[PDB]
Design a protein around this ligand. Structure first.
Ligand SMILES: [Mg+2]
Ligand SMILES: [Mg+2]
Ligand SMILES: [Mg+2]
Ligand SMILES: [Mg+2]
Ligand SMILES: [Mg+2]
Ligand SMILES: [Mg+2]
Ligand SMILES: [Mg+2]
Ligand SMILES: [Mg+2]
Ligand SMILES: [Mg+2]
Ligand SMILES: [Mg+2]
Ligand SMILES: [Mg+2]
Ligand SMILES: [Mg+2]
Ligand SMILES: [Mg+2]
Ligand SMILES: [Mg+2]
Ligand SMILES: [Mg+2]
Ligand SMILES: [Mg+2]
Ligand SMILES: [Mg+2]
Ligand SMILES: [Mg+2]
Ligand SMILES: [Mg+2]
Ligand SMILES: [Mg+2]
Ligand SMILES: [Mg+2]
Ligand SMILES: [Mg+2]
Ligand SMILES: [Mg+2]
Ligand SMILES: [Mg+2]
Ligand SMILES: [Mg+2]
Ligand SMILES: [Mg+2]
Ligand SMILES: [Mg+2]
Ligand SMILES: [Mg+2]
Ligand SMILES: [Mg+2]
Ligand SMILES: [Mg+2]
Ligand SMILES: [Mg+2]
Ligand SMILES: [Mg+2]
Ligand SMILES: [Mg+2]
Ligand SMILES: [Mg+2]
Ligand SMILES: [Mg+2]
Ligand SMILES: [Mg+2]
Ligand SMILES: [Mg+2]
Ligand SMILES: [Mg+2]
Ligand SMILES: [Mg+2]
Ligand SMILES: [Mg+2]
Ligand SMILES: [Mg+2]
Ligand SMILES: [Mg+2]
Ligand SMILES: [Mg+2]
Ligand SMILES: [Mg+2]
Ligand SMILES: [Mg+2]
Ligand SMILES: [Zn+2]
Lengths: 50, 122, 86, 52
RNA sequence: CGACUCUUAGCGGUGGAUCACUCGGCUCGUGCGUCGAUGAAGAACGCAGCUAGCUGCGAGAAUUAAUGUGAAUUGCAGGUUGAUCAUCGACACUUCGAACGCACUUGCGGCCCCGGGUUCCUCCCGGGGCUACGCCUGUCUGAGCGUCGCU
RNA sequence: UGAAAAUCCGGGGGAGAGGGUGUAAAUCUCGCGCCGGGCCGUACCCAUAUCCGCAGCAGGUCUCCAAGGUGAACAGCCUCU
RNA sequence: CGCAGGUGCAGAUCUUGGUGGUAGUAGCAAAUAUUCAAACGAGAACUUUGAAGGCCGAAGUGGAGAAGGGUUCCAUGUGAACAGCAGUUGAACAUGGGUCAGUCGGUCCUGAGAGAUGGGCGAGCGCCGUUCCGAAGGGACGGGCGAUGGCCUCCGUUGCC
RNA sequence: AUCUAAGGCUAAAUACCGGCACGAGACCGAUAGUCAACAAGUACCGUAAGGGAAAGUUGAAAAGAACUUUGAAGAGAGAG
RNA sequence: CGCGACCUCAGAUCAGACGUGGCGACCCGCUGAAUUUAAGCAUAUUAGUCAGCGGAGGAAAAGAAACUAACCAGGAUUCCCUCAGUAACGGCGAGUGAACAGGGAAGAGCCCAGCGCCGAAUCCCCGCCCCGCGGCGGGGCGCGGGAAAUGUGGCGUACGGA
């Protein structure tokens, strides 16, 4: 599907900028209980909806 | 530099538009050095500028507006941004003169029979 | 051939994203949402599922006007005046 | 658009422009390629703005 | 003298029960009882020097003005004539949505008015303002040998 | 007995438009010269491993171009790119 | 000493977790096939180069596209996870890079059909219906008046008739 | 015997699992109590209408193990 | 065929105003079932209940008698105790089921039409000026314009009234 639309392209840009893991100081703060991002996503196991 | 809002309140209208047009250029010279790598001192200045442009767009829209609410003071028709914003049912309640109106019939049934005061013994 | 070997013939779509509810329930042929009823005027909600309201109510989002009405109320909706200038 | 860029780089950096080709990255920003007229220079305008 | 198998104890492993804590909930009760065409509820997309998330905000975007307080914020760098934290009464508030130029591809337009290539003269670009249905009192413009009669 | 419409053209008629005795008229459907054409999509897989079947599953899934030899031949057997 | 109770478990093909025997066993057998040497390397029955030997045999195990997927495409590093053995390799991980139009397409027309207004029903949110019980022309045209200004020549630009 | 239909207005005494702002409790104390004490109506399944979890605790202070050594590294051995 | 006027009726991007959708704990109007009980089951009951639909408010509705009782008579509505699980209905089976009086919380009452009299004694909007104007108002002026005799205001409503 390379005949897209723009509302779709913005939707497949947000779910692309929501994929990277945490910076290493983010679990350097004081009130941290976060060890890894648990909301990641791989394109073979799940299919995003749509 | 340190720029406050207690020295902008009576100056020229277009002087602040010029100093604004110089701070946007200066901010543009720091977006360039962010990508290409620059000093950490030339990186944290960008919060100073982004929060010292807004004190001008503020003092502008103020001194711009208290003249519109001075030119439309005594007039009966004034714009929607100016006539006072309260709630929906409070723009549509009856006004104070129309609440404090009585009839002629009641006003002549209060000339002769007011409410007296009194006290009885035991 | 009603199972596995007939799951290969699934490639087109019926539903797509709405623009009033935000969910994926905009039927294309009937042109009407299943979640919110878009070409209708009134928002579809029922009482038989008291769980499908609290997915979509007022206490959910931002309340970008109600939280500054819950603040202005306790001073009688003042306008106009200022704190004393010093 | 492709007009307001051509009218706002000539004004910022004091130069004229032959043509403009634009696209949108998958991050959602619009990259813009800008030609120049053969009377100005690219090396002589990079050193003015500091991308050198 | 061994090996396997069963039995109990000491030690060590797997496992996360018990005990002790608690910025959470449940029920009752008091006082108040406040939304939106001046554009609500909801959703979408954006914003941090190093940033993903919830959270906070809207091209002035992890907040501006004012007042009150009167010396910090902090994971790391930085640079008292009022920092930072609160209150909130002055400013601003991106796209969908009762949704409002006509559509839902974000596509096709119109009427005014300013800036520019220009030199109202057309087209040319840019900027701003208007162009939804329903109804109420008025003003304007009109139709009717079915009116209804005068001139 | 085998689709409609946008858009484009030719005739018939000649209102008079409208020209003036040439430095006329609109032409243009002849030869050149002069500026202008905005918005979005555009990489890659397209299947015995990038799709749906809980998965790198002997299944399923719409299309184009197709060499030499035997031979009736895109049949079946071998060989080049 | 008194008061109140969500107050005593072996089982319900009980509910939620957790671990054994069976067991280092069933099994890793569809479509004919692999050897020799070298290099980097801690390390090679699988990685790269070369040398042979073979298969698909033009309705292909080859070259390009649509539907769908959504960063898998490219490069450099990694080796604790995943690729049902291994792994220097990877559609895996981590950093970075990439998709340029007057002519290619969307946009523009109608088809089978969907769906508003006038109107009709209906307690009502709304429904049948699409030319049918409708005052449905907002526009050109040629001429005359009042306007303005454009180098008011030639005319624009509006109002009425 | 008792009332005047076919027309109209009117505060208090009463109700309140939603809402903002508050106090208390012979209650439960992480398989209990709301589904949810934590990035919960989130992750995730289904085309949809809708269904819907698991997950608390170092120590008073990170003072969260310098340096040596074997090992390609993981993990060790002394030390602290 | 004319200029004229009241009537009926349209159009406007005419001036100024308005409503439309959401929350839905409590509320008022309509619509409205079946499991279930009767040891079966069809009238009944389950129920004027869930679901469904439309409207509001800080509270809503009701309401100053076309009323109860037969007493030596009380005297608007709502709310609690009581009468009462009673008079009555009902394959008279299962089962449903009110009110008045009495004691108490709260206490508040009223206006129009008609009948008639005062010379439209009546409103709303535009104009100019002064005051105040973050709930758009008062007084002065308008040979300045509009609606109303198919009825605008005052007195006056069943306790009698003029
Ligand atoms: Mg798959
Ligand atoms: Mg279909
Ligand atoms: Mg509904
Ligand atoms: Mg970031
Ligand atoms: Mg301050
Ligand atoms: Mg389309
Ligand atoms: Mg001819
Ligand atoms: Mg491509
Ligand atoms: Mg047990
Ligand atoms: Mg074996
Ligand atoms: Mg073969
Ligand atoms: Mg291929
Ligand atoms: Mg290829
Ligand atoms: Mg690679
Ligand atoms: Mg085409
Ligand atoms: Mg219809
Ligand atoms: Mg009455
Ligand atoms: Mg107490
Ligand atoms: Mg207890
Ligand atoms: Mg627990
Ligand atoms: Mg729990
Ligand atoms: Mg526990
Ligand atoms: Mg736990
Ligand atoms: Mg613990
Ligand atoms: Mg208007
Ligand atoms: Mg019935
Ligand atoms: Mg029975
Ligand atoms: Mg029975
Ligand atoms: Mg039965
Ligand atoms: Mg009943
Ligand atoms: Mg019945
Ligand atoms: Mg009923
Ligand atoms: Mg109901
Ligand atoms: Mg409503
Ligand atoms: Mg309210
Ligand atoms: Mg009431
Ligand atoms: Mg009432
Ligand atoms: Mg009475
Ligand atoms: Mg009574
Ligand atoms: Mg009794
Ligand atoms: Mg019987
Ligand atoms: Mg009584
Ligand atoms: Mg009392
Ligand atoms: Mg009266
Ligand atoms: Mg009267
Ligand atoms: Zn929707």
């Amino acid at each position: 599907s390379s005949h897209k639309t723009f509302r779709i392209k913005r939707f497949l840009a947000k779910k692309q900028k929501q994929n990277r893991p945490i910076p290493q100081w983010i679990w350097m703060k004081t009130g941290n209980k976060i060890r890894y991002n648990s909301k990641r996503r791989h394109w073979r196991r799940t299919k995003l909806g749509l | 530099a340190k720029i406050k809002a207690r020295d902008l309140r009576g100056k020229k209208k277009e002087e602040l538009l010029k100093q604004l047009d110089d701070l946007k250029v200066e901010l543009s010279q720091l977006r360039v050095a962010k990508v290409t790598g620059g000093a950490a001192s030339k990186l944290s200045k960008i919060r100073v500028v982004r929060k010292s442009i807004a004190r001008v767009l503020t003092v502008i829209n103020q001194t711009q507006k208290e003249n519109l609410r001075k030119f439309y003071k005594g007039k009966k028709y004034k714009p929607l941004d100016l006539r006072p914003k309260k709630t929906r049912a409070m723009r549509r309640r009856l006004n104070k003169h129309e609440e404090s109106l009585k009839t002629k019939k009641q006003q002549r049934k209060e000339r002769l029979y007011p409410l007296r005061k009194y006290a009885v013994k035991a | 051939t009603k199972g596995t070997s007939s799951f290969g013939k699934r490639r087109n779509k019926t539903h797509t994203l709405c623009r009033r509810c935000g969910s994926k329930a905009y039927h294309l042929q009937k042109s009407t949402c299943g979640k919110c009823g878009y070409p209708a005027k009134r928002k579809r909600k029922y009482n038989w599922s008291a769980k499908a309201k609290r997915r979509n109510t007022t206490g959910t989002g931002r309340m970008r006007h109600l939280k500054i009405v819950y603040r202005r109320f306790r001073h009688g909706f003042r306008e106009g005046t200022t704190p004393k200038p010093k | 658009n492709k007009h307001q860029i051509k009218q706002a780089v000539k004004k910022l950096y004091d130069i004229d422009v032959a043509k403009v080709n634009t696209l949108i990255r998958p991050d959602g920003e619009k990259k813009a390629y800008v030609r120049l007229a053969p009377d100005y220079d690219a090396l002589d305008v990079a050193n003015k703005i500091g991308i050198i």
